[PDB]
Amino acid sequence: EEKELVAHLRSIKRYFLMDQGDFFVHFMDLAEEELRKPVEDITPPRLEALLELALRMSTANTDPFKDDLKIDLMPHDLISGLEAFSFDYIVKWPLSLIINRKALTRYQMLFRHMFYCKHVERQLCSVWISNKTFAGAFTLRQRMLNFVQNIQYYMMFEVMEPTWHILEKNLKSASNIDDVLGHHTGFLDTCLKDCMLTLLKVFSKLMSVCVMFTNCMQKFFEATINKFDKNFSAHLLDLLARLSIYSGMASVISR
Amino acid sequence: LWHDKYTLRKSMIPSFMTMDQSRKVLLIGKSINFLHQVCHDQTENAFQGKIDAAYFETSKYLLDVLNKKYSLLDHMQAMRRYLLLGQGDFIRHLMDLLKPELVRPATTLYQHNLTGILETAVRATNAQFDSPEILRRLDVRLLEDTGWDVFSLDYHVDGPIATVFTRECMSHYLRVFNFLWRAKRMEYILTDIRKGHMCNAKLLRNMPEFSGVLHQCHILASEMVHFIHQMQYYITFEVLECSWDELWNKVQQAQDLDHIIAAHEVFLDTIISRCLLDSDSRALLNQLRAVFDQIIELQNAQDAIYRAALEELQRRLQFEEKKKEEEEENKRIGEFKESIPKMCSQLRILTHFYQGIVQQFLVLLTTDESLRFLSFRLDFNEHYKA
Amino acid sequence: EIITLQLGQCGNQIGFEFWKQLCAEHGISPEGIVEEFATEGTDRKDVFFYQADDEHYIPRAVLLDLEPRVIHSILNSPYAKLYNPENIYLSEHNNWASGFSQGEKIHEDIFDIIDREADGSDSLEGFVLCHSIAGGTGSGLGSYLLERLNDRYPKKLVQTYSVFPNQDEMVVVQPYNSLLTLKRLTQNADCVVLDNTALNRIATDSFSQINQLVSTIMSASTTTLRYPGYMNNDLIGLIASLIFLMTGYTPLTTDQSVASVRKTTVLDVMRRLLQPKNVMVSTNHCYIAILNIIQGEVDPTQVHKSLQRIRERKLANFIPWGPIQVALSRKSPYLPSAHRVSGLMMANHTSISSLFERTCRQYDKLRKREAFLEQFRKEDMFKDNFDEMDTSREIVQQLIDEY
Amino acid sequence: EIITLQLGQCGNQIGFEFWKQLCAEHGISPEGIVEEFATEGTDRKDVFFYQADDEHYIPRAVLLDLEPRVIHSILNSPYAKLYNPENIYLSEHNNWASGFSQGEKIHEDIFDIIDREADGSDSLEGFVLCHSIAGGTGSGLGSYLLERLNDRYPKKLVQTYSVFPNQDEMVVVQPYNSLLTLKRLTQNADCVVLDNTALNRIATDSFSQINQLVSTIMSASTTTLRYPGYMNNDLIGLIASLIFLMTGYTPLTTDQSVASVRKTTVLDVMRRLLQPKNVMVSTNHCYIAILNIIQGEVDPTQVHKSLQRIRERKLANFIPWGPIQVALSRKSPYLPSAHRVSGLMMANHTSISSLFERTCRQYDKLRKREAFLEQFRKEDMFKDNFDEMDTSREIVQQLIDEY
C-alpha cells in the first residue's frame, strides 16, 4: 500500500521489457545518428538530455516514477557505440530489498537482447522505403524481415507477456517477503530460459548478415546478394535444427 | 510415525491393568503425539471411564482435523475415479490422444512430452470441474517393449495422508492399474474393428464373391467382443461397485483412524483376489493373456484381408472409368478369386483355435467363490459346454 | 460430438421436439440461457450443444427444407431464438428425382454450413439424420446428402432415424422414394427404422405426441453418451455391440397415466422390452442382437437374475450360427423420476426383412404398368432411362436374400 | 501522426463517418469537448487529432470538393463545429480531364492548407486518401494531388481507400477515369481497394450504412497505431509486412443482430477472415500476404493452435517462389464489447488482377469507337492528343503481366 511494489514494477516493464513502443519509436528517432558514433566519442550529458526529452513528448508522460531512468554505457556487449547502451534504474532502501543489483542486471540483460532485435528490424524495414521508386533482392528481404518479426512476436506475446501475468497473480497470494523474493527471481530465471539467453551463439552471427545486408542496400552487387542468401539460409537451417531437439521450446518452430 | 517409535512393553505392565486396557493408552498417547508433529496442530471403575473418555474425544477429533485440513476422504474417492478408471469419461479421451504416441517403441519415449497430453485430457473432459489440490498430485510415471507397456498414472501422496497409503497401497494400485489398462485397450481395439466392419460393407457391397469369406470376419468378431464386453461387466459390478460398497460402509461408521486403515487395507486384498492378480491363481491369468493376444492377431489378419480387397476394388474402378487389354486382366481378376480360399483357411484356423483357448479358459475357473459369478457371465445361454 | 441433419417436414419437426427434450433434460432455457439451479451441473453438454461467449448454448443442428412454412412456424415458437440463424437454410422458391436434382443444385451452401459446424468440434464422432423416406423432400435430399457425405467424410459414423410410410393406411408415389432411399441407406448408411403404423398403434393402445415419443426414443438412446459412466462411453461402442434396427421403450406413459405407480423392477422392464407389442415398428425369424439401456437405481445382481430367468424361459430366439447386452445409465437430475426404473431396447431382428418385401411388392405392383413416371422423366437423373430403379430394386432383393 | 485527404462526394462522406467512428471510439464530444469519464484517458489522440487551447480536439482533415452541397450538409450536422473551417475548401463555382485541369488551377491554396497542417506535427508518418475513382471529382483531383504530393514530399507514406465502380450494375465514362486513376496509383501511391458491388452484397446477406462499414474497416485498420502496444507500433511496420490489397471484417453485425451471442474464439474468427465471401471486394490464383488484427482477450496459445490447424488444413494457397501475420490489439475502453473477440484481415492476393482485366476490357470496349471523347478534347491535357490514355493503358497492362 505505502511505497507500493506492484505499482512499482509496472514502471519497469514500461522501459526495460519494452511494453510501450511510443517512447522508443520516438527515442531512437532522436538518438540514432548520435549512437552510431564509436564509444568514448559520445558525450553522456547529450544522451540523458535526449532520454529526458523522449519521455515527456511521448505517452509515457503519465507516470509518477519516470524520473528514475539513467543511461549506463556498459563496457562489454551482449557476449561499439550502439551495442553498449542500456538503461539504469535507482530505488530507495525499502524497495531495494526486492529489486537489487543482483536482480536488476538481469532486467538489463534481457533488455539489450530486445533492443538488438528491435534495432535491426527498425532499419531492415527502413531499406524498404529506399527501394520503393535490382529485383531479386526483395525476395531475400522478405525472408529476413519475416524472421525477426517472428522472433519478437514469440519473445513478447509468448514468453514475457504470459510469465508476467503469472507474477501479477502470484503476488496477491504472498504471505511474507521471503516469498515475494521467491516469485520475483522465480520470474527472471524463467524468462532467461525460454528466451535464447541461456550455446545458441549462432543467433548472434545470424543477425550479423542481416545488418550487413541493410548496409549493402544503403549504398544506393548483383553477385553478392545471392551470396548472402546462401550464407543466411545456412544459419537459419541450423537454428531450426537445434530448436527441434528438445523435450515453450518446441512451439518456436510453429512460430 | 504410526508403524514404529511406539512399543507395548510386555514386561512393565502393572497387574492391575488388563492387557486390553494397555492398548488403549498406547493408542491415546500415539493419537496425540501424532496430532502435534505430523498433522501440525496444537491444542477401579472411574479409572476405566477415564480411559474411554480420553478415547471417544481424542480420536473423534483426529478425524475432524484429518478431514477438514487434509480431506482424507475426498482423496479416496478421487483416487478411484482416476487411478482405478472409475471416471470413464476422462479415460476415454486419454486413450484417443496417447494412440499416436505409444505405438512407437519405448526408446523414443520421454516423459516430458506426455504430460502436455495428460493436461489436455483433464481440461477437455468433465474432470476439469474438480478440486485443484487433488489435481496437483495426478501425474504420469514411466515403468521400466512398446508405449503400451510402460505408461501408467501414479498419483503420488506425501504428508499426513501418506500414513493411510504407506507405500504399499501405491505398490498395489499400480499392480491393479495394469489389469484395468489392458482390459481397456483390448476393448477399444474391438470397438475399432467393429467400426471397420461398419464401414467395410458400405463400400464393397458389390462383390458377391467376397462376402463368403468376409462373413467369417464378422462372426469371429461378435464372438470375440462378447467375451470382452462381458468380462468388462464383471469388473464393474463384481469388483469395483461391490467391493467399494463394503468400504464406504465401514468408513462412515468407523473412527479412530485405525478402523479406517484396516477397512482400506482389506479393500485392496479383495480387489487383488477378485481380479486374477493373486499368487495361487497364476495359472488363470496366464491363460487369460492368450485370449488377450488372439484379439491382436485378429486385427493383423483383418486389415490384410481388408486392404487386399480395397486395392483390387480400386484397380477395378480405374480399369473401367478411363476406358468408358480385356484378356490380360481376366487372368489378374481370375487369380484374385483363386487367392480367396487361401484367406478362408486363415479365418477357419484362427477361429478353431480361439474357441480352443476359451473352452479351456472356463475349465480353469472351476477351481475362489466370486469367480463363479464370472462363469455365468461368459457361459450365458450355454453356448459353450455343448 | 455429433451433428444432426433433419430434412423434410418430418425431420424438421423431429428435430424441434428432440431439441425440446434435450433442453428439458440438460436444464437449458428456451432462449439458450442456463437456469440458476443448473449452474454447477455435471452433465456433459458438448455432445449436442456448444456454448457461446454470451453464455448461451447453440445446438449442433442444421435445418433443411424444400418449403418455408414449417421452419417459419418453428421460428415463431418460444424456442426460436435458440437455433443458429446462420445454419438454418430455406429454399428460396413431392418427388425423389426432383429432390436429388435440387441436392445436386445446392451442394455448395449446404456443405459450407456442414464444414463450418464440423470445424468447431475437436472429437466429432458421427452424424445423425432425421427424415421421412416417403415424401419428396426427405427421401431425395437425404439420398443426396448421404452420398456426398460418405464421399466427403470417410471416417465418420452416419446414424439415421428413418420414418417409414404407413401401409395399412393406403404418398401415392411412396414405393419409388422408399426403394431409392433404402438403396442409399444400404450403400452408404452406417446404422433406426420407424413407421407411423405401429407407432400410432402403441400411441393409441397429433404429430406432436407421436414425435414426442420419437424424441424420447432418440434421447434415451443417446443418454449414456450424454451422461458419461464406466462402459459404453461412445457411439462406436454402441454400434459395434449390435452390427437395420427396431426400438422399444417401456415407460411410454401419458402425463395422466402416472396414477398407477406400479412397483417396477428391472426384471419386469427388461421382460417388457421383448414383446412384439412394445416394438414400435409393425421362416422361423429370430434375433441378431439386443441392447437394453436401463435408467434409475439398478442392482447388477437383479440384472443377472433377470438375464438368467429369461434365458431359462427361452422367451427369445437366436441365430443358430452365432453366439445380449444390458447397459446401465443415470437419469438427468432434473426431470421428475416418476418411474422407479425405466428401460429402452434397441435390437436387430430378421423379421424386419418383411418391411422391404412389402415395399418391393408395392414397387413391383407398379413398375409392371409404369404408373406416375411422367414427373420422374422430367428430371435429368431419370431423363434417359430408369436403370437407377432396377439397380436399387436388385440391391434391396440382395439384402433380403442376405437376411 | 497522419493527414486525411478526402475528395468527391464519396470521400467527403467517407470522412464524415470515419471521424464519427473515431470520436465515438476516443470519447470525443461532437463539439470537440472531452467527456468527464474520459478525462484520464490513456488512448493516444495525436495520431488523428490535435488538441486546441480551448481544450477541444480538431481532426487532421481537409475537405475538398468540386461542389458545395455535400459539405454544406455536413456543416449542418451536429458534428459541424468539430471540423476546422480554415482547412475546409469549396470550389466557388463529371470528368477526369476537367478535374485535373482544376487541380492545376487551384494548386496554391490546397498546398497552403496541406503545409499548414503538416507543420503542426512533429512525427508525421504518411498520408491517407479517401475517394472514388469513377466520378469526375475524386478521380482527377486525387490524381493531381497524388502527383504533386509525391513530388513535394518524397519521404511520406501515401495510403488510399479507393472505391471502385460497380460492374454488375451497369459513371458512363467510368472506364477512362478508373484507368487514369489506376495509372496514377501505380506510379505514385505507396499502398485499400473498395467496390460497391461486393460491399453491398455483404451488407445485404443507404450510403450511410455502407460507409459506416467502410469507416469500421478504416478504424480497425488503424487501431493498433491509435492504441500503442508492443509490436506493430507504426504504419510503416504495417506496410513492410505486406508489400494492392483487399479487406474483410468478421463482426459486421447489425445493431439488431446481437441476439445471437455466439461463443467466438480466435480460431473461428481468423478462419472466417479467409473465405472469399468475407472479402469485401468482388490461373491458380493465390495469395501474397495476409495480416489479421485481433481485438479483445486473446491467448497466444490459441493463436498458435489456430495457425497450426489452418496450415495443416491447407485452406489457403501461397506463392511457390516465396516463404502470414497475426497481430493483437486492445479495444477502446468505451464502446460496448458485444463481441468476445473480433477480427480484421487485410491481404494481398493475385486474384485482384481480374478487376483491371475487366476495366481494361471495358476501356478497350470503348477506345475502338471513340465514345464520349468530346468533353475530354475540351480540356488542355487532352486538347492535342490522348497519348496519356495509351500510356496509362500500357502501364496497367504491365501491372497485370507482373501479377
Swiss-Prot record, chain A:
It is found in: Cytoplasm, Cytoskeleton, Microtubule organizing center, Centrosome. It comes from the Eukaryota. Transmembrane segments: none annotated. Ubiquitously expressed. Belongs to the TUBGCP family. It is linked to Cortical dysplasia, complex, with other brain malformations 15: An autosomal recessive disorder characterized by global developmental delay, variably impaired intellectual development, speech delay, facial dysmorphism, microcephaly, and varying degrees of cortical malformations including pachygyria, thin corpus callosum and subcortical band heterotopia. Most patients have generalized seizures. Component of the gamma-tubulin ring complex (gTuRC) consisting of TUBGCP2, TUBGCP3, TUBGCP4, TUBGCP5 and TUBGCP6 and gamma-tubulin TUBG1 or TUBG2. TUBGCP2, TUBGCP3, TUBGCP4, TUBGCP5 and TUBGCP6 assemble in a 5:5:2:1:1 stoichiometry; each is associated with a gamma-tubulin, thereby arranging 14 gamma-tubulins in a helical manner. Gamma-tubulin at the first position is blocked by TUBGCP3 at the last position, allowing 13 protafilaments to grow into a microtubule. Component of the gamma-tubulin ring complex (gTuRC) which mediates microtubule nucleation. The gTuRC regulates the minus-end nucleation of alpha-beta tubulin heterodimers that grow into microtubule protafilaments, a critical step in centrosome duplication and spindle formation. Plays a role in neuronal migration. This is Gamma-tubulin complex component 2. It comes from Homo sapiens (Human). The lineage of its organism: Eukaryota, Metazoa, Chordata, Craniata, Vertebrata. The chain holds residues 505 to 858 of 902 of the full protein.
UniProtKB/Swiss-Prot annotation, chain B:
Ubiquitously expressed. It is found in: Cytoplasm, Cytoskeleton, Microtubule organizing center, Centrosome. It comes from the Eukaryota. Belongs to the TUBGCP family. Component of the gamma-tubulin ring complex (gTuRC) which mediates microtubule nucleation. The gTuRC regulates the minus-end nucleation of alpha-beta tubulin heterodimers that grow into microtubule protafilaments, a critical step in centrosome duplication and spindle formation. Component of the gamma-tubulin ring complex (gTuRC) consisting of TUBGCP2, TUBGCP3, TUBGCP4, TUBGCP5 and TUBGCP6 and gamma-tubulin TUBG1 or TUBG2. TUBGCP2, TUBGCP3, TUBGCP4, TUBGCP5 and TUBGCP6 assemble in a 5:5:2:1:1 stoichiometry; each is associated with a gamma-tubulin, thereby arranging 14 gamma-tubulins in a helical manner. Gamma-tubulin at the first position is blocked by TUBGCP3 at the last position, allowing 13 protafilaments to grow into a microtubule. This is Gamma-tubulin complex component 3. It comes from Homo sapiens (Human). The chain holds residues 459 to 888 of 907 of the full protein.
From Swiss-Prot, chains C, D:
GO terms for molecular function: GTP binding; identical protein binding; microtubule nucleator activity; structural constituent of cytoskeleton. One of its GO terms (cellular component) is gamma-tubulin ring complex. GTP binds at residues 134-140. SUPFAM superfamilies: Tubulin C-terminal domain-like (SSF55307), Tubulin nucleotide-binding domain-like (SSF52490). Component of the gamma-tubulin ring complex (gTuRC) consisting of TUBGCP2, TUBGCP3, TUBGCP4, TUBGCP5 and TUBGCP6 and gamma-tubulin TUBG1 or TUBG2. TUBGCP2, TUBGCP3, TUBGCP4, TUBGCP5 and TUBGCP6 assemble in a 5:5:2:1:1 stoichiometry; each is associated with a gamma-tubulin, thereby arranging 14 gamma-tubulins in a helical manner. Gamma-tubulin at the first position is blocked by TUBGCP3 at the last position, allowing 13 protafilaments to grow into a microtubule. One of its GO terms (biological process) is mitotic spindle organization. Phosphorylation at Ser-123 by BRSK1 regulates centrosome duplication, possibly by mediating relocation of gamma-tubulin and its associated proteins from the cytoplasm to the centrosome. Keywords: Cytoplasm, Cytoskeleton, Disease variant, GTP-binding, Lissencephaly, Microtubule, Nucleotide-binding, Phosphoprotein. SMART domains: Tubulin, Tubulin_C. It is linked to Cortical dysplasia, complex, with other brain malformations 4: A disorder of aberrant neuronal migration and disturbed axonal guidance. Clinical features include early-onset seizures, microcephaly, spastic tetraplegia, and various malformations of cortical development, such as agyria, posterior or frontal pachygyria, thick cortex, and subcortical band heterotopia and thin corpus callosum in some patients. Belongs to the tubulin family. It holds the Pfam family Tubulin_C. Transmembrane segments: none annotated. Changing residue 355 to P: In CDCBM4; the chaperonin-dependent folding and hence the yield of monomeric gamma-tubulin is compromised. This is Tubulin gamma-1 chain. It comes from the Eukaryota. The keyword Lyase does not apply. Disulfide bonds: none annotated. The modification Phosphoserine is found at residue 123.
